Design a protein around this ligand. Structure first.
Ligand SMILES: [K+]
Ligand SMILES: [Mg+2]
Ligand SMILES: [Mg+2]
Ligand SMILES: [Mg+2]
Ligand SMILES: [Mg+2]
Ligand SMILES: [Mg+2]
Ligand SMILES: [Mg+2]
Ligand SMILES: [Mg+2]
Ligand SMILES: [Mg+2]
Ligand SMILES: [Mg+2]
Ligand SMILES: [Mg+2]
Ligand SMILES: [Mg+2]
Ligand SMILES: [Mg+2]
Ligand SMILES: [Mg+2]
Ligand SMILES: [Mg+2]
Ligand SMILES: [Mg+2]
Ligand SMILES: [Mg+2]
Ligand SMILES: [Mg+2]
Ligand SMILES: [Mg+2]
Ligand SMILES: [Mg+2]
Ligand SMILES: [Mg+2]
Ligand SMILES: [Mg+2]
Ligand SMILES: [Mg+2]
Ligand SMILES: [Mg+2]
Ligand SMILES: [Mg+2]
Ligand code: NA
Lengths: 33, 66, 225, 103, 135
RNA sequence: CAGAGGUGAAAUUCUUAGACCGCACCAAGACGAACUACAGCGAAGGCAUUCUUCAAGGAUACCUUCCUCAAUCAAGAACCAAAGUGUGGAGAUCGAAGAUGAUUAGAAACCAUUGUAGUCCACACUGCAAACGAUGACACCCAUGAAUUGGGGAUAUCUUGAAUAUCCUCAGCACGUACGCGAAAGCUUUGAGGUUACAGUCUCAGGGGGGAGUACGUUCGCAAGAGUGAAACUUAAAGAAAUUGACGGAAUGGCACCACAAGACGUGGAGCGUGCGGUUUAAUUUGACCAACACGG
């Protein structure tokens, strides 16, 4: 409990997902540069 | 050897299924004995009531209160 | 067999206690280069103060005393005061909630060496007509009480010998003087010394230990049945 | 939805910022010392029958001399306080009842 | 093997009753603690791991201790009780009371009783996470 | 001297090369129990042993000084739990990663035994928290009772100045039961009141849900990342507070042989009667799947 219904997964893990996505995109572009 | 004990009060049915009775028993011993009038809490199975008599195989164990 | 090689000994408290031959102990027989007296020295025996001073009352039953074995005299174990302590149950029971628990550590060396640490504990109390929900002490009064206790204990104990210091602590005249002279600072429910520990001993003296015990009672352990 | 005006703890908004946690007596969970459920327990070492048997064999203990007790300040996390029934969920009207003394 | 005292004189030991929630120790020493007379535990009396902390194993251990210490010559016992203490539980395990009762009933005299579980005036961090043990 | 540990029960692990346990010590690193509170201090983050020391900060007291010097904010600046980063140090405890043992359908988890990085210190970074009172700062008015912390003012008790008593007062953290407000939960001199009868002052942010605090650019950062921050596109709701039901491996109080306990007979195993289903058949007419199946008499 302690919270209302989220739209999808737990927001902290969704934020962790987006973090890993940003790190991968940064690595990709540093590769192309 | 078995000591004889006299049930002096029924404290209530113990256990989850209600098949055990918790009773207070006084050890019926001869006067001048260490266990004379000594009382102890025992768990009993079977139909029992006040002033019934039990055969204690051991007199050192007391039943945990309920 | 394990106990067939064991011998019995008497532990002897110093002469300022009434029950001289408190406690009994066993040790291995001397065998080879391993001498019993050489492992016996340094053993520490704990005893209730009420057992040692039978003529004392109920407060003595809450204080434990430890003695260390200086020397072996036949089957007697000559001892010196090691430590003293309130029992855990009594100290735990002395605590209340809505009051200040003020502790003082005092370190004082007796007139013959023998540094000791005193560990004094005191409690505030409400006054007779007080209606307040607590009797917490102001920090200035706590520091003043601590300073006064330190001064009184150092002055009283640096002047005397180890045996007289032990007599002051066990007959708790020092604690009575402390509560009498410290109550004007703060009203005190209780001021007691919870533990005394000898922390530094002087070099071993034979004459001083023999003067600590006076008339040494005989040990019958060595004699035959 | 705010369940409690005190938010389950003794820390008003402008009293202090951080209260150092303690380990739950039962599970070890870290709990702010204000929030934890604190009980001071004075416990007999033996029940009445064991006490009688031991006092019969003791020159120290008897009617004149009481046997020692156990003293413990116990602080519980909320889950362990509820599970051990030292504290129970209460009806909304009864939640404001506070006891200041032991009863 | 006993001390050379008159008949019925009280020769004291100290019993260290260590009742955790996993086991029970009944340990008799002299009053300095250095020399051990006898040590019997619950696991010395039961076959199953789950039974060593129980009152019955503790009582059997206390009976053994009295049996051996009667031939040692010790007949009176000062008592030291402890829980695990330290940074773990201060509540004694189930077997302390039973061991002490069996000591008293089997014919030993009881002297001073004291509770000596180690209490920190401040401690190292206790096992488990900040979330505690999660069952 | 034969076990100890650990669990729901175990096993991993330790142990006659003496473990566990016992007494007194030694060393090292953390931490400062009980007292500890709807208590104190701090701008916030935070801060509990003692003593000695450095600078501060607030309140109170004042017929001291002074004379508008203020309030609040882009820009700029300083501080900031934990985790994390760098260089030295430390390394007891606990413990991300990992190892082993259990549990399980599987179990990379929860549980057990361990254990690296960490956890602690100095110096330098990072600048994010449910960094919360989810409530910006300054100022005014505002009902009642019991309290509490510090300082003052006036006039019963105890010790020998300290504390306590009664009353008042300024400042502080709060509690219970008035207006008034609010969608309500609730708030209430501690406003979320004094607002459609809408104006004391300054300032930050918001404008249906997602996409998304994502992309691109840029600044900062050793890095991790931080700050700033869209659109295409998609969607009719998302959301809030309360109400009544239903449900809960939540609590409490009761109850039942269509429940169990103590039991007695059976059934499930065989043969056979009967009903139901499958297969078959030209058709094997159909209904019914605890509350169908010797039921549709
Ligand atoms: K960024
Ligand atoms: Mg819930
Ligand atoms: Mg909720
Ligand atoms: Mg929300
Ligand atoms: Mg006060
Ligand atoms: Mg809370
Ligand atoms: Mg403050
Ligand atoms: Mg905080
Ligand atoms: Mg609470
Ligand atoms: Mg659970
Ligand atoms: Mg074991
Ligand atoms: Mg060894
Ligand atoms: Mg070890
Ligand atoms: Mg402290
Ligand atoms: Mg850090
Ligand atoms: Mg770190
Ligand atoms: Mg380490
Ligand atoms: Mg570890
Ligand atoms: Mg699960
Ligand atoms: Mg583990
Ligand atoms: Mg929008
Ligand atoms: Mg059949
Ligand atoms: Mg039809
Ligand atoms: Mg039909
Ligand atoms: Mg039918
Ligand atoms: Na909060």
């Amino acid at each position: 409990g302690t919270v209302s219904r989220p739209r999808g997964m737990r927001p902290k893990w969704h934020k962790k997902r987006i973090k890993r996505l940003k790190l991968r995109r940064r690595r990709m572009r540093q590769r192309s540069k | 050897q078995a000591q004889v004990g006299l049930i002096i009060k029924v404290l209530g049915r113990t256990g989850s299924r209600g098949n055990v009775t918790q009773v207070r028993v006084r050890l019926m011993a001869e006067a001048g004995s260490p266990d004379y009038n000594r009382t102890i809490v025992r768990n009993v199975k079977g139909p029992c009531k006040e002033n019934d008599m039990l055969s204690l195989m051991e007199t050192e164990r007391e039943a945990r209160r309920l | 067999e394990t106990m067939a090689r064991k011998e019995w000994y008497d532990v002897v408290a110093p002469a300022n206690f009434e029950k001289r031959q408190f406690a009994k102990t066993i040790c291995n027989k001397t065998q080879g280069t391993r001498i019993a007296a050489d492992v016996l020295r340094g053993r520490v025996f704990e005893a209730n103060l009420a057992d040692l001073n039978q003529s004392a009352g109920e407060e003595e039953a809450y204080r434990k005393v430890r003695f260390t074995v200086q020397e072996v005299q036949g089957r007697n174990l000559l001892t010196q005061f090691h430590s003293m302590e309130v029992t855990t149950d009594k100290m735990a029971s002395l605590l209340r909630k809505w009051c200040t628990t003020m502790e003082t550590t005092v370190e004082v060396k007796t007139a013959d060496g023998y540094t000791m640490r005193l560990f004094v504990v005191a409690f505030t109390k409400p006054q007779a007509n007080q209606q307040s929900r607590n009797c917490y002490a102001k920090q200035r009064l706590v520091k003043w009480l601590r300073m006064r206790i330190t001064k009184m204990i150092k002055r009283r104990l640096s002047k005397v010998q180890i045996k007289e210091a032990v007599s002051l602590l066990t007959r708790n005249v020092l604690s009575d003087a402390l509560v009498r002279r410290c109550n004007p600072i703060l009203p005190l429910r209780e001021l007691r010394i919870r533990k005394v520990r000898v922390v530094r001993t002087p070099k071993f003296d034979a004459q001083a230990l023999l003067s600590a015990h006076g008339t040494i009672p005989a040990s019958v352990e060595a004699d035959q049945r | 939805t705010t369940k409690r005006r005190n938010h389950g703890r003794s820390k008003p908004a402008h009293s202090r910022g951080r209260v150092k946690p303690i380990h739950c007596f039962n599970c070890g969970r870290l709990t702010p010392k204000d929030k934890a459920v604190g009980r001071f327990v004075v416990r007999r070492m033996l029940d009445a029958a064991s006490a009688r048997d031991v006092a019969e064999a003791s020159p120290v203990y008897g009617a004149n001399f009481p046997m020692p007790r156990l003293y413990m300040k116990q602080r519980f996390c909320i889950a362990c306080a509820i599970h051990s029934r030292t504290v129970r969920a209460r009806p909304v009207g009864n939640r404001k009842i506070r006891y200041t003394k032991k009863v | 093997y006993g001390p050379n005292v008159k008949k019925g004189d009280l020769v004291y030991g100290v019993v260290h009753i260590f009742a955790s929630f996993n086991d029970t120790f009944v340990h008799v020493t002299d009053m300095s603690g250095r020399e051990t007379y006898v040590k019997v535990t619950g696991g010395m009396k039961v076959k199953a791991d789950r039974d060593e902390s129980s009152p019955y194993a503790a009582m059997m251990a206390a009976q053994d201790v009295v049996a051996r210490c009667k031939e040692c010559g010790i007949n009176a016992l000062h008592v030291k009780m402890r829980a695990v203490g330290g940074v773990r539980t201060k509540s004694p395990g189930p077997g302390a009371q039973a061991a002490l009762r069996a000591l008293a009933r089997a014919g030993m005299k009881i002297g001073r009783i004291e509770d000596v579980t180690p209490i920190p005036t401040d401690s190292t961090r206790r096992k488990g996470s900040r979330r505690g043990r999660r069952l």
